[PDB]
Ligand binder design. Structure first.
Ligand SMILES: CCCCCCCCCCCCCCCCCC(=O)OC[C@H](COP(=O)([O-])OCC[N+](C)(C)C)OC(=O)CCCCCCCCCCCCCCCCC
Ligand SMILES: CCCCCCCCCCCCCCCCCC(=O)OC[C@H](COP(=O)(O)OCCN)OC(=O)CCCCCCCCCCCCCCCCC
Ligand SMILES: CCCCCCCCCCCCCCCCCC(=O)OC[C@H](COP(=O)(O)OCCN)OC(=O)CCCCCCCCCCCCCCCCC
Ligand SMILES: CCCCCCCCCCCCCCCCCC(=O)OC[C@H](COP(=O)(O)OCCN)OC(=O)CCCCCCCCCCCCCCCCC
Ligand SMILES: CCCCCCCCCCCCCCCCCC(=O)OC[C@H](COP(=O)(O)OCCN)OC(=O)CCCCCCCCCCCCCCCCC
Ligand SMILES: CCCCCCCCCCCCCCCCCC(=O)OC[C@H](COP(=O)(O)OCCN)OC(=O)CCCCCCCCCCCCCCCCC
Ligand SMILES: Nc1nc2c(ncn2[C@H]2C[C@H](O)[C@@H](COP(=O)(O)OP(=O)(O)OP(=O)(O)O)O2)c(=O)[nH]1
Lengths: 167, 48, 446, 54, 341, 368, 96
């Protein structure tokens, strides 16, 4: 159930990829959906509340699946795992966005927003850099962090010696 | 040369926090052995 | 170099004393003369002072600003005539000039950026403060927000270069060649905006049409060059990456130049038409610059000097006509040869220079960019022929239509041209020709 | 020539309690300018007792 | 500290409360300091002349009580499993502590209470809330080392903090959304260091300390009032509003130096993508600041004419003018500062 | 309350008055100096109002002399058009644009229909408001009561009367109410109000007795206009203020004697209302603790600039009160370059002030 | 697990406390009622942890002192509520 998208090469393990992307499709859908049903739409009754959960999450699942399928389909059809594949993938999810929003233009333009988004992600994978890397420099003080102490209570004697032990 | 070294040095300090310059958090045990002192002081007083 | 800076700083108090408007330009013109004597520069940096140097590239651009910023005061005599916060107005230019001098005289890339954008805010005050039409708001934001949106990401690209080079100084940067695709877009898409490129020029027709006469001078005079000057310093270490994506920029600017020339022919506003003419020529400048050849680099430097003086010049004339006719539309402005015949001579010479007419310095630069582009690819001859053809199609339409026909009917009586206006026009055009004699200096910055 | 200045009609943009009014927000009104909302004196209902006779 | 001797006390006890939190070597000790701080602010915040003020005294109380309650809940849970004030490897129990602290400071996902309580505060109250109350919460977050949770708050903070602010006209409510954005920069600066955060916070408080006085001295609460505001020298009014640009972090002014040092360190730490979303979103924040400058940069207005005169307090104005001067010319003093090296 | 005969002599202050004209009274001043220690039976506020030209000024001066009360002369536009050095601003009006031309009572009586009337009425409210606050500072810092001719509370009558005659428009009245609402709530209502009910016919005769040039020549003082004021004082003002302040009504104490009036005031008792805490009568001046006294003193002594900054209510849909931008620039040029307006009062060297190099002081509750 | 056999019950009780503190009841007092309910559960856990220490239960007094003050302060704010709005209903407050 826990599959990572890039665990395998680009044209591989379709069932592994779909699960990985749908994971983020659902999580973002629910996260936004919680705000939608309490703060903006405010439906009444236990049944319609699910419609907002389905409405905001459902098509957002369709997008992720579409991108994986189109990206995966393109990777095999063209014979190479290159940036245009992810660009080709993005326009699929954009197309689903229009069908979701009943708007011809919204789907088209959003595909480009999504299209260039995917391209940069592939750029990162292929060049060897990360979007939110672990900080290499983490500073926990100034220059005199071990010197600037103002406490008044006398520190009773020590119990450890930096010197080499005696025996 | 100095700002490509000084930058490099800082990375090693941060990688292992093995110097008391910037990447070291002073962990003081002073208070606990103050409490141990106070406990010992009160141990003597017990009795009547 | 500090001689210039401290001269300007101590001229700041002149903004506060009253009846010192005209004593300012003389101090601004005199310093140009003093700066004009200290030309002993070379390709490498010279006259070091704590972080301020100057090479042949920076010198011409600095001297261009001092000249242009001095003409701003002549052109904007109406501010003095109506005491319309003239003291504040003067302080805006003196501050603005200092930012420019530092920007070109800065030796380190971080500084160039530091004063690169900082000059913007004095310009932004200029538009809102002294612009007539209500649209100076909706044009005030475009100038500020197109620039900030693409300059803030450039700041990241600058810092990422310290951690590799270890320094900002331009000479030390040239020793490196970078391969990262995004970094290329974080140091040129920021300058491609300010050139401007054809597809991201939407701010230029709005800022120029709405800004006052003085703001039009500096916007067309020095702001379009800071983008050009910046590129000349940062393609040195983007040579490898420049070869993979140059063909995108060359095509856009070349096709962009042609399409804008047609847009020029369908304009009906003097200010708009001159502003769109800036995008047309700036397309050739950028095109030749990205060719990276010796000719394309020297030529681009030349044309930036020449074009600034001209387009700044043509904004004088539009202001002169607008000041009296009261409207900047072509339909109102007709047959001005029969109202102000002495003026029409200056219309022609500045107009002729814009269409690369001889013996102007403009033709020297344009011959060169054309050479580099052709050498880059013989397919570039197609539009490069169209662009040079249409670059005269609108210039004649600009000149002929506004000067030749029968006079407007509804116009009310107005003053004739004054000596100030004629003197202003001479100083714009006359250097633009005599500079050909000593192109030796303002060409071979490499 | 005529010079445009920020006029009453320009500043009507900022007159409301919100820049982009809609049905919900347009119904509102700007708070008191001194930002003090004096509480309104209301009714006084006091309990009653038939103290006595028993 | 404006009306009576009692107000003098509550201010001091606020200082003591904050200090106890940031000087405490254990979660439990830290939590106590928050309680001390809680009741020091409410009486300063509650005034019965305003129907709105008491409502503000409520929303803050319910929020802060819940925050400290949940904060203590997790801290007990944290050392029920580790038996130490510190967790060797961060996990869910440490996330819960982070969530409370963010709500304690009104970060993005839990900021809702923060602007919605700004309607009924005096300007001097907002300054205490905007600047000082954010010390204790944010300073404890430096101990916790969760990245994604902290990272998410930054991304939402700059976004929600900016987009929300475009629609406001109440300056008190506008500054709240402005403050949420600057809060986003802190948390970004907090995953990398603190000395930047300590520097950045001091500058942020400085600018807010300035803008609050200008509204407080001339009792302005709505955008329209800016245009109606009368000043003898339109040059003077023009220059006072040039502090907003510094609050927008434009480099010619002092207010950029803080933003600048936060980028020279985030970039040094390879957090390039974050800076794109942050710095880009700051433009929208820079936008509505300019909407305020519409009343200054244009400099001839149609104004009501039953005022010829400015009536202003001296000492506040005397200190405000000094602070404003550095807010415009403070850049050349970066040479003096030696806290970045 | 206790006239000189009752005390048998001049007022004896409980403690030395605080020099409120020269030293500020902030929170940290309040610690060492307390307010309640200076309050006497005569520490009250008296508003001596009436119709137009009812001899209020003469009656007030005599009255304020018997009760050892400070007398505050009624405000007039000379306070706006005459700067401290004495120069007459009105001389500058040939230069100014027509909309910014000076406007006074003379003008109102001569061209009442001019659009500047709406301006003129708001100024009177603003002037009374500032003067009224000045009286409170004198009361709270000195303990000596004050006698006012017309409080800002009674000023809306003139605006309302002018509206009925049609001099003002709907917009101007709407603007005036918002200012009054925005500002009036922050004052302390007077302890006592005295009214001089001159019948309408009498005041019309009386006005011609002054033989003031513009008034007799004017048309404003019609039966309708003067009648409107009478209906407004008694039905709206007096009916409202009496809920808080003691109310005495005389046909004309200006034509009558004041010694009888002072003896009428002293009969009125001001303590019977103190018993119930929430009693409306004189509610404003009921401070339980010493802190409340000082707070009120601080507000008027130290926070008056705040009080005078509430008059900033932006209203531009009204065209009369708006001043065009082009005029404002011109008006700013002329107004602030006049002799004595270059700098704050007490610093204009060209007017003779000296020692500016070594001078650093500014006045308290002073402008600018 | 240890945490499930010994510390589950108080935590489940705590979250039920919070869900009272957020549910829609007309009167403000419903918040105060649920406030010291949660405090009662916080005491219970804190008392579990303090007893893992042999002699540290004295800190229970420290916690209780802050418990009453937040309740006492919570009650004062309600009093100030009444004398500006006249009633404590949630729906009576401006929604912002
Ligand atoms: C019965 C009442 C008799 C009249 C008032 C007390 C006269 C005896 C003076 C004792 C000292 C002052 C006590 C007092 O008034 O409270 C402090 C009053 C204010 O009372 P407060 O109600 O604002 O609360 C004070 C809170 N602390 C203590 C934290 C400051 O004045 C001061 O605080 C400073 C001046 C003290 C000297 C005043 C005489
Ligand atoms: C600042 C904003 C910069 C945004 C884009 C930055 C990345 C630049 C594109 C880099 C690139 O490699 O583009 C060309 C690439 C072709 O490469 P490839 O996928 O291998 O396909 C053809 C060869 N087989 O094809 C692509 O990557 C698609 C580029 C589409 C760009 C649309 C804008
Ligand atoms: C524009 C909006 C894009 C939203 C973010 C898309 C995204 O979530 O991509 C990353 C995600 C996971 O990819 P990964 O690098 O393997 O990290 C998983 C760590 N658990 O999903 C992926 O696997 C990346 C697939 C490409 C998505 C391109 C979207 C454009
Ligand atoms: C039209 C709108 C339609 C509706 C919206 C559709 C999008 C919904 C997306 C919902 C899901 C969002 C949450 C996705 C979580 C993914 C994991 C994550 O938290 O971000 C990290 C992710 C990869 O992590 P990284 O640091 O690069 O390390 C490598 C990991 N294998 O980082 C990434 O992979 C980033 C991918 C995007 C990068 C875009 C950069 C170019 C932007 C151009 C504009
Ligand atoms: C290095 C650190 C120190 C930098 C310098 C700090 C001092 C800068 C300000 C000095 C000028 C102050 C007086 C002034 O503003 O100039 C006079 C005038 C302003 O307008 P106005 O109100 O008419 O002034 C009357 C007083 N002569 O002048 C003007 O019209 C414009 C004045 C410039 C305004 C700049 C803001
Ligand atoms: C149109 C809207 C979309 C605009 C483009 C959004 C996508 C921006 C790129 C994604 C975020 C940052 C990516 C990055 O981190 O680049 C790092 C790259 C690799 O360099 P390195 O330092 O060696 O990596 C770490 C060690 N392996 O090396 C570098 O790139 C560092 C050089 C600076 C990169 C800054 C990139 C951000 C540019 C934002 C432009 C915003 C749009 C302006 C218009
Ligand atoms: N439009 C307007 N005129 C006012 C106002 N207050 C006083 N006046 C005008 C009305 C008359 O023209 C004129 C009458 O002056 P007063 O009644 O105040 O008489 P004065 O105080 O000079 O001495 P006296 O009343 O006789 O003791 O001033 C006001 O609020 N609005």
């Amino acid at each position: 159930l826990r599959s990572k998208y890039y665990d395998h090469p680009d044209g591989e393990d379709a069932f592994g990829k779909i699960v990985a992307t749908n994971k983020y499709a659902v999580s973002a859908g629910v996260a936004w959906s919680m705000f939608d049903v309490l703060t903006l739409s405010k439906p009444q009754g236990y049944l319609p509340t699910l419609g907002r959960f389905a409405y905001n999450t459902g098509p957002l699942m369709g997008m992720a699946t579409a991108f994986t399928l189109t990206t995966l389909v393109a990777t095999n059809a063209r014979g190479k795992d290159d940036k245009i594949n992810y660009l080709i993938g993005g326009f699929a999810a954009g197309g689903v966005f229009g069908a979701w929003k009943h708007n011809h233009v919204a789907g088209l333009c959003a595909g480009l927003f999504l299209g260039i988004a995917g391209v940069i992600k592939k750029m990162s994978i292929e060049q060897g850099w990360e979007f939110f890397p672990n900080t290499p420099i983490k500073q926990y003080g100034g220059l005199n962090i071990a010197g600037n102490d103002w406490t008044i209570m006398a520190d009773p004697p020590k119990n450890w010696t930096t010197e080499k032990p005696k025996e | 040369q100095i700002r490509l070294l000084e930058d490099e040095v800082r990375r090693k300090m941060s990688e292992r926090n093995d110097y008391q310059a910037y990447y070291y958090r002073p962990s003081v045990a002073k208070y606990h052995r103050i409490s141990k002192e106070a406990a010992d002081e009160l141990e003597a007083l017990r009795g009547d | 170099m500090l001689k210039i800076i401290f001269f300007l700083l101590f001229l700041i108090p002149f903004c506060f004393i009253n009846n010192m408007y005209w004593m300012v330009q003389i101090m601004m013109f005199f310093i140009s003369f003093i700066f004009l004597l200290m030309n002993n520069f070379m390709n490498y940096w010279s006259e070091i002072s704590y972080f301020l140097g100057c090479d042949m590239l920076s010198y011409g651009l600095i001297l261009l600003s001092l000249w242009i910023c001095s003409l701003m005061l002549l052109a904007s005599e109406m501010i003095n005539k109506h005491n319309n916060y003239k003291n504040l107005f003067l302080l805006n230019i003196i501050i603005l000039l200092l930012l420019l001098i530092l920007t070109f005289s800065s030796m380190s890339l971080f500084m160039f950026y530091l004063f690169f954008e900082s000059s913007l805010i004095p310009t932004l005050f200029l538009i809102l403060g002294w612009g007539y039409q209500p649209e100076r708001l909706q044009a005030g934001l475009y100038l500020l927000f197109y620039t900030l949106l693409v300059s803030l990401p450039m700041l990241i690209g600058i810092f990422y270069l310290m951690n590799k080079i270890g320094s900002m100084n331009f000479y030390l940067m040239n020793n490196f060649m970078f391969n990262y695709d995004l970094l290329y877009f974080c140091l040129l898409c920021a300058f491609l905006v300010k050139m401007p490129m054809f597809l991201v020029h939407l701010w230029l027709p709005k800022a120029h049409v709405e800004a006052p006469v003085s703001g039009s001078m500096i916007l067309a005079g020095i702001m379009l060059k800071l983008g050009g000057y910046g590129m000349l310093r940062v393609i040195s270490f983007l040579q490898l990456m420049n070869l993979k994506y140059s063909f995108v920029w060359i095509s856009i600017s070349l096709v962009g130049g042609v399409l804008v020339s047609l847009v020029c022919l369908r304009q009906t506003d003097l200010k708009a038409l001159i502003a769109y003419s800036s995008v047309a020529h700036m397309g050739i400048v950028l095109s030749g610059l990205l060719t990276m050849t010796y000719w394309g680099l020297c030529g681009s430097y030349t044309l930036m000097i020449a074009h600034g003086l001209c387009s700044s010049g043509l904004f004088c004339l539009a202001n002169v006509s607008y000041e009296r006719l009261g409207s900047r539309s072509m339909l109102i402005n007709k047959g001005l040869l029969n109202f102000m015949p002495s003026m029409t001579l200056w219309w022609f010479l500045l107009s002729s220079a814009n269409m690369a007419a001889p013996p102007t310095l403009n033709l020297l630069g344009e011959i060169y960019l054309l050479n580099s582009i052709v050498s880059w690819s013989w397919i570039s001859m197609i539009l490069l022929s169209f662009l040079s053809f249409f670059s005269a199609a609108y210039t004649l339409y600009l000149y002929s239509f506004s000067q030749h026909g029968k006079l407007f009917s509804g116009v009310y009586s107005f003053s004739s041209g004054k000596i100030r206006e004629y003197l202003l026009m001479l100083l714009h055009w006359l250097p633009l020709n005599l500079l050909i004699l000593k192109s030796e200096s303002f060409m071979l910055w490499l | 020539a005529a010079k445009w200045y920020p006029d009453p009609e320009f500043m009507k943009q900022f007159s409301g309690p919100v820049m982009y009014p809609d049905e919900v927000t347009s119904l509102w009104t700007v708070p008191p300018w001194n930002s003090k909302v004096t509480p309104v004196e209301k009714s006084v209902r006091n309990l009653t007792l038939n103290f006595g006779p028993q | 500290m404006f009306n009576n001797s009692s107000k003098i006390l509550f201010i001091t006890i606020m200082i003591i409360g904050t200090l106890i939190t940031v000087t405490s070597n254990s979660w439990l000790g830290a939590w106590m300091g928050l309680e001390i701080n809680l009741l020091s602010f409410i009486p300063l915040l509650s005034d019965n002349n305003n129907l709105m003020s008491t409502e503000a005294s409520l929303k803050y109380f319910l929020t802060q009580v819940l925050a400290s309650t949940v904060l203590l809940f997790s801290s007990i849970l944290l050392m029920l499993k580790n038996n130490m004030n510190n967790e060797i490897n961060e996990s869910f129990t440490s996330m819960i502590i982070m969530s409370a602290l963010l709500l304690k400071s009104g970060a993005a996902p839990f900021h809702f209470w923060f602007p919605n309580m700004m309607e009924g505060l005096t300007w001097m109250n907002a300054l205490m809330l905007m600047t000082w109350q954010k010390i204790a919460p944010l300073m404890l977050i430096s101990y916790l080392n969760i990245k994604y949770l902290l990272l998410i708050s930054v991304i939402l903070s700059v976004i929600i903090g900016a987009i929300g602010g475009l629609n406001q006209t109440s300056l008190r409510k506008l500054m709240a959304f402005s403050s949420i954005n600057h809060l986003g920069w802190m948390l970004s600066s907090l995953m990398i260091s603190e000395s930047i955060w300590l520097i950045y916070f001091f500058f942020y408080s400085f600018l807010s300390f300035v803008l609050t006085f200008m509204f407080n001295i001339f009792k302005l609460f709505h955008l329209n009032q800016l245009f109606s505001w009368f000043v003898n020298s339109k040059i003077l009014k023009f220059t006072l509003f040039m502090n907003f640009l510094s609050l927008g972090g434009l480099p010619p002014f002092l207010g950029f130096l803080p933003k600048w040092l936060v980028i020279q360190q985030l970039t040094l730490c390879n957090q390039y993508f974050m800076l794109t979303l942050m710095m880009m979103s700051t433009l929208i924040t820079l936008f509505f600041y300019l909407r305020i400058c519409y009343s200054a940069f244009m400099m001839n207005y149609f104004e009501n004419n039953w005022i010829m005169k400015m009536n202003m307090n001296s000492i506040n104005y005397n200190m405000y003018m000094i602070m404003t001067f550095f807010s415009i010319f403070g850049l050349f003093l970066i040479s003096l500062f030696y806290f970045m090296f | 309350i206790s006239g000189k005969t009752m005390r048998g002599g001049p007022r004896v202050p409980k403690a030395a008055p605080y020099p409120y004209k020269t030293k500020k009274y902030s929170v940290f001043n309040a610690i060492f100096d307390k307010t309640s220690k200076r309050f006497d039976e005569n520490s009250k506020v008296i508003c001596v109002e009436g119709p137009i030209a009812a001899g209020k000024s003469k009656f007030a001066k005599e009255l304020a002399e018997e009760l050892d009360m400070e007398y505050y002369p009624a405000v007039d536009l000379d306070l706006i058009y005459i700067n401290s050095y004495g120069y007459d601003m009105r001389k500058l009006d040939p230069q100014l644009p027509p909309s910014c031309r000076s406007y006074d009572v003379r003008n109102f009586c001569l061209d009442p229909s001019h659009d500047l009337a709406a301006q003129f009425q708001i100024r009177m409210y603003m002037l009374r408001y500032s003067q009224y606050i000045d009286a409170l500072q004198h009361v709270l810092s000195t303990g000596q009561g004050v006698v006012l001719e017309r409080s800002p509370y009674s000023d809306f009558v003139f605006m309302e009367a002018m509206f009925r005659q049609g001099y003002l428009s709907r917009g101007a009245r709407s603007v005036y109410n918002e200012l009054r609402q925005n500002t009036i709530g922050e004052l302390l209502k007077p302890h006592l109000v005295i009214y001089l009910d001159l019948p309408v016919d009498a005041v019309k005769k009386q006005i011609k007795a002054r033989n003031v040039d513009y008034e007799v020549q004017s048309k404003v003082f019609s039966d309708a206009y003067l009648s409107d004021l009478e209906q407004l004082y008694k039905q709206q003002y007096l009916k409202d203020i009496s809920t808080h302040a003691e109310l005495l009504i005389y046909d004309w104490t200006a034509g009558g004697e004041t010694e009888v009036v002072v003896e009428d005031i002293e009969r009125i008792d001001f303590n019977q209302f103190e018993a119930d805490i929430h009693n409306k009568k004189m509610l404003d001046w009921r401070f339980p603790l010493e802190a409340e006294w000082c707070e009120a003193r601080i507000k008027y002594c130290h926070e008056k600039p705040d009080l005078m900054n509430y008059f900033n209510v932006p209203r531009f849909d009204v065209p009369e009160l708006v001043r065009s931008a082009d005029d404002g620039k011109v008006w700013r040029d002329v107004w602030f370059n006049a002799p004595g307006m270059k700098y704050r009062p007490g610093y204009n060297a060209d007017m003779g002030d000296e020692g500016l190099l070594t001078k650093t002081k500014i006045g308290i509750n002073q402008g600018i | 697990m240890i945490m499930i056999l010994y510390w589950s019950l108080p935590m489940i009780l705590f979250i039920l406390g919070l869900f009272c503190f957020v549910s829609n009841r007309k009167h403000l007092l419903s918040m105060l009622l649920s406030l010291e309910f949660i405090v009662l559960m916080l005491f219970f856990m804190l008392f579990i942890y303090l007893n893992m220490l042999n002699y540290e239960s004295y800190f229970s007094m420290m916690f209780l002192t802050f418990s009453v003050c937040e309740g006492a302060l919570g009650l004062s704010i309600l009093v100030s509520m009444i004398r500006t709005h006249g009633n404590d209903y949630f729906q009576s407050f401006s929604i912002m």
